[PDB]
RNA sequence: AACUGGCGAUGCGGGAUGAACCGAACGUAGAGUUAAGGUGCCGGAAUACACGCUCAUCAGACACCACAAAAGGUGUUAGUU
RNA sequence: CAGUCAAGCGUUCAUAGCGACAUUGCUUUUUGAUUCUUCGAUGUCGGCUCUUCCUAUCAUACCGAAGCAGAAUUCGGUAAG
RNA sequence: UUUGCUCCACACAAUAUAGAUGGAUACGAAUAAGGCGUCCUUGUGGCGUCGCUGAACCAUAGCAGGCUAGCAACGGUGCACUUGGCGGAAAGGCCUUGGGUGCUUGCUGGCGAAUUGCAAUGUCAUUUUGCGUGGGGAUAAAUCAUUUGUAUACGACUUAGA
């Protein structure tokens, strides 16, 4: 028979599976649509979430009861030391999707960015990009060829960048390496931009301007194995419940003779990849500035 | 099958009260001679008080088209049973022989009324040769003077599965 | 029944030319050039004397002999739009709120904008197709004239105006407000 | 200027239309459409070529470009007379379609020795042609 | 008969072509199908779109990752049609589907090679004129296939290259014919003609 | 010449079968080039060989042959029925067999 | 309940699948021929040959059997007065 | 639960909305009839909890109709998001 | 940690081929229309011609293709070098300048074939791997353990550590 009283289902089925994300660093699943007219620009930056604080600002909303009145607002501070450009990637579009045809790296790579490629860094010969550096050190001996390949092909160009973990006050010493898509001009112009910025450090103000509405992509806080009551927010069973109350009582009907995917079950909570949109930049503050 | 037209003459069994009965005749379109005799007795049972036991068949002779290589108009009066009732209808065919006209009439009734062989009585087939007696438009269409038409979109059946040029439907 | 041959003779005015490839029809006249694809009809054409063209269907059904005369009328429409032009006159109907209709050019597009229809703050923007000219007809109050060669484009623009001036949530038998096509004629009639 | 429409003419089936029988006893002989029974069948006759006078489907015959004057429903004698007067068989054999049929028959009727001879002559002609290609 | 047979899928009815190709694969023929975005299905686009939506509605209730996997690309649609006609759960059927290959457009291994057609599966020959039909690329885009524009772009590029090749081939053929006109009509040509060739 | 073949190619299609029962004793062969029984009649009685290769050498050769004969015609489409001294292994469905031109009647 | 034929007690070919339907009843094999049913592919066997009718934004597709009705439609076909 | 017909109701007006006398159906959610499975046992009422599905749609989206001037309503369509 | 590892070539040895036996031989679009030539007012044009199947086209003669000679024959073709490009959809293939060498059945010759005995696929194509030879080329990391806590039931995971 039917449900006696209608209630909305617990949880969102579009955020499934509620498993641990593949890594700490959440990737940009999709970049802004490309427009050739706009200048070549980074579409992303990498920061380290430091903490939250409070700001007070005069709200300007013509019609709210708090128009031209002070409002207190929570804010998040992301420490964003300038990220170094090391290498670029070209993506040729195929009837199976975007495929990277080649990746050209920079002449010299930072010790943190090779620590990224290592795991037992101290017990290592640090042989990393040594033969690539030998391939380098000339005008176009083997680098102008790869750049010309990316110019002739690779309708989508992404630049490889890494964070300055040493500047950031953590204990990691292992830079975070990522790609940011260049979303302006021609493919040749994007490759020109990447070449010019090889081994150059880009600051956050160049890409993000105040009062912008940006997205944050990150892996949420992990909370380990969780019961269904907190993992899905299901109703708690009454106090006099034998064998437990932080559970879902009926996890399925007799038929189909299976537990459905849409029934709430205990497991890992948190440490999921998330992309949360429409966060307003309240300030872009400079480090070299008391 | 290939229908043939038969003349079947049969009579009642002669009795000593009065010998030599009236010796009725019929034209029957049938696959062969056994079916011709069977249909003759069917229609004679429908008409007169006689049956195969009470009568005999004195002659069966298959009749040929007088000129089986000349095109004529054939008016066919039929009666047939539907799923609801019995109806008399009149169709006409362009053909070279009455047997082929009747065969194509049988196919026609099957296709246009789902009327099977059992539920069809060919009342009459009349060979009409003059125009202005052809009443159906789907025949007067081909009695048009100096008629010529093309056959657009020729489809050529191939023997091999794979072809190495794209086809043409030109004629 | 499969009629063996159905043919209609279309007449070509002395001032125009018809170029009929496989099934692309191009009519050229004083007013311009009008093209139409017809690869969906499966008809045949035969030029006769530069002034008659016979459209024919061989062994066509009822639904085919219908389309034959349909394409005949369509080609006559292209010819008439290339010789005389098509003019559609629409009147404004409004009980209390005056309908205010003008032309704007956003990025060079000649949109028609309607304001104060039943006195609402919404702006009703309709685009204008290729080859369609809008004239705000003086000498008669609240008239808009849509003129061109392609009768399909002209009549479809007029239909857009009519279908953008719809009234909702009201008894449309009493709220007769709207922009209605009152005249469907030729541009150069009685030349 | 002048209106242009592609003629779009394709081998009308009509009285006097010369056809090439595709399947059956004849299967490769010429006949004349004597009468048109229907959109799908015609009375044909092939008296010179050896096709008997008969009613056939238009599917069984292939219309040829040839056509000679013929009264509708003319008897076999008249069909043969008009066919011989118009010399239909000769102007058929002159065509590249009849010549293709004849060439096909000849190539099929070649023997093994004649296939070897074809190979030898092919080699000689290939040598001379491939020499003329570079020398011209 | 051939090592690999490559079929231009353009203008082919999907079911007839799949039946033909399945029979060939079971008989032991390696087959590549190209231009699967240009395959045809009889009936209106709305009709076949509703058919695909009835296909989409079917999924294992308790886990959709177990249910029927509704593939969207035209090549994968043709492959599903053919897998229906091959007994794919046995080793023989697995071998036949291993012999089959199907693509969108014409990849580099095959744009340089001859492409054939299957007349008993061609829409122009098989469908009665006037009947509506759909194109597999249009249907695939409507049901969620993401690469119609990429395929069309690369198809235009390949067609341009192939048209240049055809112009070059015609130039070479005209030149050889004009230059061997002299060497033709010779004694050897007369003997070859009289002996059939 | 570089072509030495003296046999016609054929495919071993399947066994003689109904819907749900096969008979491994009689195989069905499609001679490549034949599409009608009237043309398959030429191959009635001709020898057929399935030639395969095994990694182990038995009598001086790594190639093994199973011999058979065309018995009759099968169907309307030029397929014929063949019988072999050993039934074909059934892994050879769609494999290549050699139809020799002997015993000859030309 | 009546007559008969069956299943029970019986496999085999067909009806996808079924105790009863269809065909046909059974020793172990071989060749040929067929029944009922089928011959696009699964699947052995004609994408056979004919004449039509049908286009369905829930087509239809083979007896038992696995459903559909009254009433309607210038859809289209044939026909009567 | 839904149809067909149409004597009447609806100021006149069968069919806006209804609709008698009759008649055709669908469904298996709020009853029987039967006794095929289960009596070497399939844990029965209701509630609580939770998921999913159907549509014969209460609300919401967009529409058509009215005895729809507006407001509010009523009758239907696509529609189970 | 006596030649560990990669690339090229070939003294061999081994396991097998979903099945070599001359060639997967490339325009596109249309089909109630096209292809190929030619002419121009270069266009949806005029003219000619073709199709009606690949029954085509290429390649095909020589000990599974031998050894030697000649003749209008400087054209075909294999190998191996070099040269200029083209090809990113899965390019991994397609053209091209030039120098050597082999053959040529384009035409005419000389010699050999046997005996596998009257057929027996009568062994000639690879897909990998192993073991060696001779010519080059570069001399890493991961895991455990310790640590960490942006992580965690345990695994797994951010991290650090000469």
UniProtKB/Swiss-Prot annotation, chain A:
Phosphothreonine modifications at: 102
Sequence positions bearing Pros-methylhistidine: 242
Phenotype upon loss of function: A mutant confers resistance to trichodermin, a trichotecene toxin produced by plant-pathogenic fungi.
Main localisation: cytoplasm
Sequence positions bearing Phosphoserine: 23, 155
Sites of the Glycyl lysine isopeptide (Lys-Gly) (interchain with G-Cter in ubiquitin) crosslink: 38, 135
Keyword line: Cytoplasm, Isopeptide bond, Methylation, Phosphoprotein, Ribonucleoprotein, Ribosomal protein, Ubl conjugation
Cellular component annotations (GO), alphabetically ordered: cytoplasm; cytosol; cytosolic large ribosomal subunit
GO MF annotation terms: RNA binding; structural constituent of ribosome
Segment forming the signal sequence: none
Family classification: Belongs to the universal ribosomal protein uL3 family.
Function: Component of the ribosome, a large ribonucleoprotein complex responsible for the synthesis of proteins in the cell. The small ribosomal subunit (SSU) binds messenger RNAs (mRNAs) and translates the encoded message by selecting cognate aminoacyl-transfer RNA (tRNA) molecules. The large subunit (LSU) contains the ribosomal catalytic site termed the peptidyl transferase center (PTC), which catalyzes the formation of peptide bonds, thereby polymerizing the amino acids delivered by tRNAs into a polypeptide chain.
Additional remark text: Present with 450 molecules/cell in log phase SD medium.
Protein name, entry field: Large ribosomal subunit protein uL3
Organism: Saccharomyces cerevisiae (strain ATCC 204508 / S288c) (Baker's yeast)
First-to-last residue of the parent protein present: 2 to 291 of 387
Curated annotation (Swiss-Prot), chain B:
Keywords associated with the record: Cytoplasm, Isopeptide bond, Phosphoprotein, Ribonucleoprotein, Ribosomal protein, Ubl conjugation
UniProt keyword Ribonucleoprotein, yes or no: yes
Any one of the GO BP annotations: cytoplasmic translation
The keyword Phosphoprotein is assigned to this record: yes
Superkingdom, taxonomy of origin: Eukaryota
Signal peptide extent: none
Matching Pfam families: Ribosomal_L18A
MF (Gene Ontology): structural constituent of ribosome
Cross-link Glycyl lysine isopeptide (Lys-Gly) (interchain with G-Cter in ubiquitin): where in chain: 124, 130, 148
Positions where Phosphoserine occurs in the chain: 31
Location in the cell: Cytoplasm
Example of a GO cellular component annotation carried by this entry: cytosolic large ribosomal subunit
Physiological role: Component of the ribosome, a large ribonucleoprotein complex responsible for the synthesis of proteins in the cell. The small ribosomal subunit (SSU) binds messenger RNAs (mRNAs) and translates the encoded message by selecting cognate aminoacyl-transfer RNA (tRNA) molecules. The large subunit (LSU) contains the ribosomal catalytic site termed the peptidyl transferase center (PTC), which catalyzes the formation of peptide bonds, thereby polymerizing the amino acids delivered by tRNAs into a polypeptide chain.
PANTHER family per UniProt: 60S RIBOSOMAL PROTEIN L18A
Misc note: Present with 54300 molecules/cell in log phase SD medium. There are 2 genes for eL20 in yeast.
HAMAP family in the cross-refs: Ribosomal_eL20
Family: Belongs to the eukaryotic ribosomal protein eL20 family.
Descriptive protein name: Large ribosomal subunit protein eL20A
Organism: Saccharomyces cerevisiae (strain ATCC 204508 / S288c) (Baker's yeast)
UniProtKB/Swiss-Prot annotation, chain E:
Gene3D superfamilies: 1.20.5.4280, Ribosomal protein L13 (3.90.1180.10)
GO CC annotation: cytosol; cytosolic large ribosomal subunit; nucleolus; ribosome
Predominant place of localization: cytoplasm
Subcellular location: Cytoplasm
Glycyl lysine isopeptide (Lys-Gly) (interchain with G-Cter in ubiquitin) cross-link site: 175
GO biological process, one term: cytoplasmic translation
Keyword rRNA-binding listed: no
Remarks, miscellaneous: Present with 43300 molecules/cell in log phase SD medium.
Role of this protein: Component of the ribosome, a large ribonucleoprotein complex responsible for the synthesis of proteins in the cell. The small ribosomal subunit (SSU) binds messenger RNAs (mRNAs) and translates the encoded message by selecting cognate aminoacyl-transfer RNA (tRNA) molecules. The large subunit (LSU) contains the ribosomal catalytic site termed the peptidyl transferase center (PTC), which catalyzes the formation of peptide bonds, thereby polymerizing the amino acids delivered by tRNAs into a polypeptide chain.
Listed name of the protein: Large ribosomal subunit protein uL13A
Organism this protein belongs to: Saccharomyces cerevisiae (strain ATCC 204508 / S288c)
Swiss-Prot record, chain F:
Post-translational modification: N-terminally acetylated by acetyltransferase NatA.
Cross-link (Glycyl lysine isopeptide (Lys-Gly) (interchain with G-Cter in ubiquitin)): 46
Family: Belongs to the eukaryotic ribosomal protein eL33 family.
Its job: Component of the ribosome, a large ribonucleoprotein complex responsible for the synthesis of proteins in the cell. The small ribosomal subunit (SSU) binds messenger RNAs (mRNAs) and translates the encoded message by selecting cognate aminoacyl-transfer RNA (tRNA) molecules. The large subunit (LSU) contains the ribosomal catalytic site termed the peptidyl transferase center (PTC), which catalyzes the formation of peptide bonds, thereby polymerizing the amino acids delivered by tRNAs into a polypeptide chain.
Misc note: There are 2 genes for eL33 in yeast.
Oligomeric and partner information: Component of the large ribosomal subunit (LSU). Mature yeast ribosomes consist of a small (40S) and a large (60S) subunit. The 40S small subunit contains 1 molecule of ribosomal RNA (18S rRNA) and 33 different proteins (encoded by 57 genes). The large 60S subunit contains 3 rRNA molecules (25S, 5.8S and 5S rRNA) and 46 different proteins (encoded by 81 genes).
Protein's name in the database: Large ribosomal subunit protein eL33A
Originating organism: Saccharomyces cerevisiae (strain ATCC 204508 / S288c)
